Amino acid sequence: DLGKKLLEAARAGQDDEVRILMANGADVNATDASGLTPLHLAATYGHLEIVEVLLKHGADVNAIDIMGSTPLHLAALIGHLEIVEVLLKHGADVNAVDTWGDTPLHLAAIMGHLEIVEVLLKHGADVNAQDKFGKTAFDISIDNGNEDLAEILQK
Amino acid sequence: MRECISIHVGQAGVQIGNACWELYCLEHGIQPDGQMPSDKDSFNTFFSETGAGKHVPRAVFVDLEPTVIDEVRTGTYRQLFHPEQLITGKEDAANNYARGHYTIGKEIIDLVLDRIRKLADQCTGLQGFLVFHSFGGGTGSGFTSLLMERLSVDYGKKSKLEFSIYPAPQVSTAVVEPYNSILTTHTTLEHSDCAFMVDNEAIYDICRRNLDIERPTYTNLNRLISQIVSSITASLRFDGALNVDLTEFQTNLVPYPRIHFPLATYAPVISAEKAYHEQLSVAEITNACFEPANQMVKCDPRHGKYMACCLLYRGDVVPKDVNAAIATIKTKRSIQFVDWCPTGFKVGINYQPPTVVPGGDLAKVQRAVCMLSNTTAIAEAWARLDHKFDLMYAKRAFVHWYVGEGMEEGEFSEAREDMAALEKDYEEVGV
Amino acid sequence: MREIVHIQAGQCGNQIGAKFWEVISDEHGIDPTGSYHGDSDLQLERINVYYNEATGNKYVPRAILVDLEPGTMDSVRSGPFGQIFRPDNFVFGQSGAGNNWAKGHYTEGAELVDSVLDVVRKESESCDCLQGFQLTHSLGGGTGSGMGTLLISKIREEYPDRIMNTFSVMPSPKVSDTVVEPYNATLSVHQLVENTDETYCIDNEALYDICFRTLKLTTPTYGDLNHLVSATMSGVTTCLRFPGQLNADLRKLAVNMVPFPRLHFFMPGFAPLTSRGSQQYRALTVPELTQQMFDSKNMMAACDPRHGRYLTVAAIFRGRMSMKEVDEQMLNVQNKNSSYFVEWIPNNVKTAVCDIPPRGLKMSATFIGNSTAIQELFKRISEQFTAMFRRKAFLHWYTGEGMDEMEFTEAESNMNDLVSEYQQYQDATAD
Ligand SMILES: Nc1nc2c(ncn2[C@@H]2O[C@H](COP(=O)(O)OP(=O)(O)OP(=O)(O)O)[C@@H](O)[C@H]2O)c(=O)[nH]1
Ligand SMILES: Nc1nc2c(ncn2[C@@H]2O[C@H](COP(=O)(O)OP(=O)(O)OP(=O)(O)O)[C@@H](O)[C@H]2O)c(=O)[nH]1
Ligand SMILES: [Mg+2]
């Protein structure tokens, strides 16, 4: 099965191996045991080129894993701003909610990726979105004392 | 001769001991090298004599660190003390009672006992020991209580008198000082026959207004403390009729062995800058002995009852002036004694004026008086300590520092219970 | 209690550690060659605390420089005092850790940690009265965090009675946007809770905020942050390098500042806040220095003290100033902000005054506080950790080095209990 090979080729960042497996019929939307797609692992490990070649060959930009994490969730969490913009331009749900109530704005705010926060707000991120604990991205900024993030959310 | 051995534990005990022995030599006319030109009687209770006419104090200086005692080894009285009587460790108890009692203190206690035994072997008839130590220090509380326990075994018949430094926040160096104070009081209670507390706050305040010292330091406090301690031990080093030995201290001031904390009051305390002050009369200094602001421990004897009261005068004091001044106190002021005690004032007069130390903040006085009284109002000082103990112990704060140095946590409650019984002991006497 | 063995692990540990030696050597009058060049006796009174006297008035810093990548080997020598470090104390590895906490704690760092313990033993056995160890390191990396905590555990197992002090640098996305740093910090904090006696929380989040907002530095560099660190490390260690009575050693400071074993993470503060290359007439008054020490914009950790309660506080004042004025301003802030101090620990604020101010300053004020508000710092790292751990992001980097996944949950559980402990004592009343 070439799905497990494409999964690890997308994680390791082997662009040439991703293009070869795709031509050999590898499941682009294959999932590991956690439900992670090659687009998930590509967006997690900062492989922008593999992210683009995946979306160009039928990758579900809004695929969710077992915990409901989208590639935008992980890209905003790890802080790959370039992958975040590419995912958003390909139809990524900016307000996707995972199993913990977190939106891509929540993870970008918690991790201090202020530039990703500004891009998510520009693309329609719901500031009123609450996690499972009743906290919004603005609530996290106040609770953590992150004044720089609070001013960004106030625009 | 009925000799007395002084023991100075910790920094407070050593520094105050250094000020006391400086004052003793000045009172007895002893040069810093130990030579006294005016004969070489009664001063022998505190000083031994060598073949070369050198008078060595019967003093032991013990500290778990050498910094403070090295000042005595390289001070003005470097040649005065026996060099082997200056015992130092390398690591202090860190403000931990358990360190000075259970761990670090055990590494030097047997050496301290052997050096004390060497001094006791030079005594014809040892009275006992005067122990100088702090309440809040790890050594002054931990090692002292351990030393008091050991002295009770090797010298069961000898008397043990304490000069204790009550903690005060203005000069305090540790937050666990209420712990160390309560822990050392419970373990020393049965091993001490008489303990003169020195409230650092009372001495601090007297230095502030009575001496016009803005920020008093240990030097200012120790010079005043040594003035009071010398007034208490003057009867042991001079001829007299009141408190001639350590046994009389318990007989006159200690009706029950548990309530052995007499309140000391000294008067007058005049700044040296007012050298031309008018000489205060016997009645004025005697009335100042009942003013709460002249006392060594912050309390209100008007709120308590007297079980004993000794008046030790120094200087131009005619005994008929004491009786007249005492007859006015008994009549004018409502000074209530306990019903089971003679409503009387024991009076001892040393007709030599008090000696002022050069460099001190005290002025020369023609007459002074130190009042030793056992009043139930000193339980207020215990209450202030026990409250600070209860506030911290309720949350078990800083307790881990003590259990980590070979001390079970039950000793905290066992010491706190004994203090609750001590406060109760003051209640059954005066209601 | 005199000599301290300094250790610096990782890039940040050696960077802020070299700045520590550069700052205190200037205060002690020690030039990079190791000779004395000052004109004050207080600079040697306790010079053996951090320096070893070598040959011909040469003071070699008792420091050990550790790292996994050899790039920092030439980085310290490129500095001013790079030649003052002993070449024997340079224990560096072949390959770095790459921000992998497991690489420093289990694989690469564990392979080289035995070589560091050899130099630690060589410096410790050359100590007359070693009081403990101090370690500068960051928590976000792999060497200073993963191996630093391993060095702490192995040194504690070898010297259990010694004080384990650390200058730990908390990570922040404002300074380094590396997402695995919450992993390394949480695993390190789990180790610091069990194996250190005193930890100075130097939060990079607060360092960036002071430079960006207060100092008005648009682009603050590591030198701008380390300027605040070196000023803090010099202030918090003032009582250890100069003659004093309060907190003069690592254990007495720990006994006074650590009421509970796990709550040993201090919030340091410095006043006045100054940037390098731009110092101006400070002329800060004692009340201005007092109000700034307890201000949140002056805290080295991004925590609002007004949101928590002070368990213990040690204030250090440097420079020539009125001792009485410091006592009044200290008692005034405690009166004005009475609700911000725990009531069940009386006299929990301790004040020390040193006559030697730091470089380029006439008046200085250093704050050392054990505040329950430090949970805000731990909660921020916990939320960043939980955000990463719930998605299992980059978890293979750690488990690939033989590290168990349950160690992540155990570290997160322990830090969550630490936050719960601070909140528990934040809500406790005297009743
Ligand atoms: N009056 C007076 N009090 C002192 C002096 N030195 C210390 N104290 C007080 O004693 C307490 C501290 O105990 P120390 O005597 O310094 O300590 P120690 O007995 O040497 O114990 P460790 O050093 O902790 O092992 C505090 O309450 C101080 O205010 C002094 O010279 N005079
Ligand atoms: N304040 C301050 N933080 C620093 C400095 N150098 C690194 N850091 C912080 O330390 C963290 C990274 O740890 P480092 O010390 O660089 O790493 P290390 O301990 O050398 O470990 P490896 O490089 O992974 O082998 C990040 O949070 C950086 O912001 C410095 O000079 N000052
Ligand atoms: Mg001491």
Residue numbers in the entry:
A (entry chain F): 13 to 167
B (entry chain A): 1 to 40, 47 to 437
C (entry chain B): 1 to 42, 45 to 360, 369 to 441
Text taken from the publication that reported this structure:
Notably, 27 ligand-binding sites have been identified in tubulin so far56 making the protein an excellent target for SBDD. These reservoirs (loaded simultaneously into the multi-reservoir extruder) were sequentially measured without disrupting the low-pressure helium environment of the Prime chamber and without entering the beamline experimental hutch. For this part, we determined 7 crystal structures: apo structures for both TD1 and T2R-TTL, T2R-TTL complexed with four ligands known to bind to different tubulin sides, and TD1 complexed with the photochemical affinity switch SBTubA4.
After commissioning the device with lysozyme crystals, we collected time-resolved data using crystals of a membrane-bound, light-driven sodium pump. In two commissioning beamtimes at the SwissFEL Alvra endstation, we validated the general performance of the multi-reservoir extruder and determined 13 structures overall.
